[PDB]
Design a binder for this molecule. Sequence first.
Ligand SMILES: Nc1ncnc2c1ncn2[C@@H]1O[C@H](COP(=O)(O)OP(=O)(O)NP(=O)(O)O)[C@@H](O)[C@H]1O
Ligand SMILES: Nc1ncnc2c1ncn2[C@@H]1O[C@H](COP(=O)(O)OP(=O)(O)NP(=O)(O)O)[C@@H](O)[C@H]1O
Ligand SMILES: Nc1ncnc2c1ncn2[C@@H]1O[C@H](COP(=O)(O)OP(=O)(O)NP(=O)(O)O)[C@@H](O)[C@H]1O
Ligand SMILES: Nc1ncnc2c1ncn2[C@@H]1O[C@H](COP(=O)(O)OP(=O)(O)NP(=O)(O)O)[C@@H](O)[C@H]1O
Ligand SMILES: [Mg+2]
Ligand SMILES: [Mg+2]
Ligand SMILES: [Mg+2]
Ligand SMILES: [Mg+2]
Lengths: 291, 291, 291, 291
Amino acid sequence: VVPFNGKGTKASIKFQTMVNWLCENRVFTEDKWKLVDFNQYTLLSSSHSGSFQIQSALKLAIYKATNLVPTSTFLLHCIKDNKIVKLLLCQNYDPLLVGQHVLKWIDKKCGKKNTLWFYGPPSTGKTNLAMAIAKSVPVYGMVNWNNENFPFNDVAGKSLVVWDEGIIKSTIVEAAKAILGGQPTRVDQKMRGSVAVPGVPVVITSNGDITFVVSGNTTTTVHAKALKERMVKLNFTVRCSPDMGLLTEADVQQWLTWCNAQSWDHYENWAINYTFDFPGINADALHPDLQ
Amino acid sequence: VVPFNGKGTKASIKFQTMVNWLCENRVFTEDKWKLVDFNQYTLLSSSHSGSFQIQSALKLAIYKATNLVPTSTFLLHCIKDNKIVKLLLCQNYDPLLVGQHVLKWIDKKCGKKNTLWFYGPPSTGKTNLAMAIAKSVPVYGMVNWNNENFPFNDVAGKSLVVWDEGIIKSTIVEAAKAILGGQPTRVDQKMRGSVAVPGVPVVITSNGDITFVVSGNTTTTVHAKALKERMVKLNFTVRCSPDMGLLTEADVQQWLTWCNAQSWDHYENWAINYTFDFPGINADALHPDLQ
Amino acid sequence: VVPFNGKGTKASIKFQTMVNWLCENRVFTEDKWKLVDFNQYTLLSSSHSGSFQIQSALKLAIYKATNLVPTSTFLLHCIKDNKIVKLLLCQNYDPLLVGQHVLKWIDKKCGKKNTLWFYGPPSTGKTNLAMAIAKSVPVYGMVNWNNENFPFNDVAGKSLVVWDEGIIKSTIVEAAKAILGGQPTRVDQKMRGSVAVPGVPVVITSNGDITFVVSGNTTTTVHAKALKERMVKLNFTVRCSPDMGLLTEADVQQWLTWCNAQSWDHYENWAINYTFDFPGINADALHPDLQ
Amino acid sequence: VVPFNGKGTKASIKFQTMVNWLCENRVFTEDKWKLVDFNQYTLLSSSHSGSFQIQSALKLAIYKATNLVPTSTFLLHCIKDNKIVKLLLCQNYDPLLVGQHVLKWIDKKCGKKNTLWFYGPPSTGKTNLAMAIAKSVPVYGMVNWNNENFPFNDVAGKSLVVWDEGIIKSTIVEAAKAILGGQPTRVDQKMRGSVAVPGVPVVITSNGDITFVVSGNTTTTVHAKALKERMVKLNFTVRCSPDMGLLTEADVQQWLTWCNAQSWDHYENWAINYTFDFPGINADALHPDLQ
Ligand SMILES: Nc1ncnc2c1ncn2[C@@H]1O[C@H](COP(=O)(O)OP(=O)(O)NP(=O)(O)O)[C@@H](O)[C@H]1O
Ligand SMILES: Nc1ncnc2c1ncn2[C@@H]1O[C@H](COP(=O)(O)OP(=O)(O)NP(=O)(O)O)[C@@H](O)[C@H]1O
Ligand SMILES: Nc1ncnc2c1ncn2[C@@H]1O[C@H](COP(=O)(O)OP(=O)(O)NP(=O)(O)O)[C@@H](O)[C@H]1O
Ligand SMILES: Nc1ncnc2c1ncn2[C@@H]1O[C@H](COP(=O)(O)OP(=O)(O)NP(=O)(O)O)[C@@H](O)[C@H]1O
Ligand SMILES: [Mg+2]
Ligand SMILES: [Mg+2]
Ligand SMILES: [Mg+2]
Ligand SMILES: [Mg+2]
């Protein structure tokens, strides 16, 4: 489609430049704008026009970051000292395959297996890898912030949804299957006009088996197969020492950048058959620098 | 206290004999009365007096069974062929200590540890050992039968309460802590005019860990300590042939009688300080009749 | 169990004789009692005692008919001229096998398969063959009489439940799966206090496929596997003559009496594995009497 | 069917005699009993037993009069002077045919044509003829008495239902089709336990075409065909002078008794296939008495 030949004024060009600046510097909230540039916010908020422009530019930046640019782009751009690879080696997992799977999963290139699940016993490194990952995406949401009766109230405009120490009830199990597999909600179909558009990755950490759905004062098992069809499970069964601090965006960015450079030939070999359980660590097919 | 000098008539003695028969024949409901002796039920149901007497005698027999006679008397009435012993041996547990603890627990002689917990993965023998105990006692009740919002609605007049594959919610945890610890409910305290209401033993089977209380869409571990003060845990890990069938009342009675017949020296050594987790079988402490 | 040695009076014996008379003559409602014997009803209803006795005897007779005497005895009491065998032959079915299956089904001896489904184009005999078994049993109930939101109100005390031109909605599918399989509800288990409560046979006639569950304005197939495990399906294709005539209980009694006397091996050879579709006719194995 | 062995005492026999007296003398309400025999009512109301017996006898007499005895028997108890025959001659109708049709319709022998409709212009004798036939039957009801939302709430136990100056709305048109066609409501089937327990004759008088069903603020015609099927119509197109007075029970009884013993041929052919409109006179075939 040939773009419309409409020509803008100087104010429109400056507004577009400000939107580009907002998207470039990963500023997506009013508080972040105040913390990053108080001068521009103060100058803009002196009139009605600037107040309208702030909201309009914020919305446009959200849309551009979550719809027009791949999420992995806000993930990229000597590896043995990284904390992420050491953590993934402690729990006997291959860092390269996990990184490639994360790269493919955050771009909605894994099919119906839209959910990533972390499982294991207390202090084993789970809300630390999930929340480092979440802090590197442009916008992320959480199920804990939302109301109990509406756990999926706000999923549009987000790059990731985090469910921390979560359990699935029979009241919402029908809705969760829609969001854990990537199926759009009905209202998203209605306003967009198509049958499937938005999509959103989901990451879950828990201490117990979420395949068991609580019904009343008891538990059922009839929903196990459908839930297992849509998840990839990792076992964090090795406790970690308190010698490790918080995981930061730089560590995960470096880890993913290093993973993206190496050979991908192994990954699609697994991609013929996506398994519920992630493959375990090997030694014949390990990366030479990781030894 | 010297009993009152009241003298009964022929009808009173007949009614007392009927109550004794009802209590001795282990019949406590109208349906079992019709099934066992339809002639007497039909003869009584011919007038208002007989209809009143049916309900009065049923209530009196229930009270006598659940309050005046210890439950362990009903349970009591070669051993290799017993399925209970083999099932408990396959699960790395000593049948003798388990039997002694069951005998002491059903009589409310364990203190604050009023709950028995069976934990383990699918088909390992748990709704089997529990519902043969439930049928070995005069009257038992289920949390499953009760309403969702009132799990502990009916506990008066019961010798046992069974919670099958259940989960503890945060909206009912306050009543759960009281009922699983043997603490009498406030309504019974008010109605009976005393603070010495006995309380009912509880048995729980589950696939997951019930010390993680379901709150909202997450699980909390704040109560995990307190619950551990009121429960004894048994792990059922090994699985069992699909050929062994329903376990029966005769097997439970024989196992409990044989357990009671032996010595009672090792139990009170453990009873000095009760442990949350039931100890496993010992290599040399096993009874000669079981080695 | 030795029955209670209590002895009844003359009035008790007369009441028991009246209950037996009510059972023998298949009188289970007040209107039928008035129609059959107005003299005894008028004599009894002259005082409070007789009015109480009427209801007591009716309840006892219903209970004895439903729970203490097998229903097949009420059905049991040349064959080429019978209408039922001709109707079942027109639809390419063996009347002997159908009769034996009906006899085993009405006594709750089929396990999980408690439902009988008649399906086909209109005017093919479905209501006729089903509402003749219903009139042959002592007491029968109808799903159509009950409320729309509560289709399973009166299922206790019934020998058969009839669902005519029925469709399964998504709101009642949970209770429908339980009732069609012969399992009891929580209320029945709690009131009886026996967990093992017998179910009631169900017969359904319909013009469409009832495995498609109505949800909203759509039909779904997520329950089509559990429903087929509980049902036996017969196809009524051949249209019937416009002067077929209303079927009579005597025809059903004659057909079932003839079927019960014949050999059974051709039934339990198939009864190891129950199929969703009823086996079709076989001229080689057809009984020589009705050739 | 054999009556029960039970025989009554003196009190039971006296109660049965009192019930027979109540049924014979056409006393079916307490006010009628006080008006006809105040002495017996006063002696009965001395104690609780007589008060119970009064209600029991009234209910038994009502049931006997409305279920065990044909209605026409209450109606079958020179001919020029009769007012009914003169009125029917002034309306261009054959009195013999009307009498025979009334006799066959009061006994529920007309099939689906359970309703009788009188239509015509103001003051032409219609609340007259219809309320003189209702005075002859033991017990009758009226749609006027009942609530507007539930016009057919109390129809059990009546020999006739009168709908005076009526009109059919779209809210109840489904229920009326049951009453006007003679089919039982689901409540009657539920309580009695059968499929076709009762059926009540209906008589309707109106000044307009009742086949037009009122819907909202407009009129529909989609229900006309069924109403035409379930009804028989007469045209009272001639008004009457005010000298004529009321129509009594004696006139109706004499008219119906006279029509009962003339012939049953000119009706028998018509009963082969009923027409919506009642045939008019025919001087070719008219009875010599009134000719
Ligand atoms: N805010 C923090 N600052 C420093 N170290 C932290 C912090 N949070 C967690 N850690 C460390 O990270 C490791 C695991 O913590 P965490 O990732 O929260 O565990 P987890 O498996 O998610 N726990 P749990 O929620 O109890 O099942 C431990 O070594 C902690 O000491
Ligand atoms: N109804 C039954 N009839 C015959 N045998 C049975 C029955 N139920 C259980 N069994 C036998 O008992 C074994 C244990 O079953 P069960 O006691 O139900 O296990 P469980 O651990 O409670 N199961 P689950 O509820 O899946 O955690 C089975 O493997 C069968 O061999
Ligand atoms: N009341 C009746 N009296 C006489 N014959 C009847 C009666 N009802 C049905 N039949 C006959 O029996 C046959 C079966 O009719 P019926 O059993 O009502 O049909 P059905 O299979 O339920 N049809 P439908 O409900 O339209 O799918 C027809 O050929 C009818 O003529
Ligand atoms: N209460 C009465 N007292 C005396 N005569 C009456 C009475 N009611 C009716 N009549 C006579 O019966 C005739 C018919 O009246 P009625 O039967 O009420 O007519 P209708 O056509 O049913 N009425 P409507 O359509 O409501 O105007 C009258 O013209 C009177 O002669
Ligand atoms: Mg955590
Ligand atoms: Mg179990
Ligand atoms: Mg039909
Ligand atoms: Mg009028």
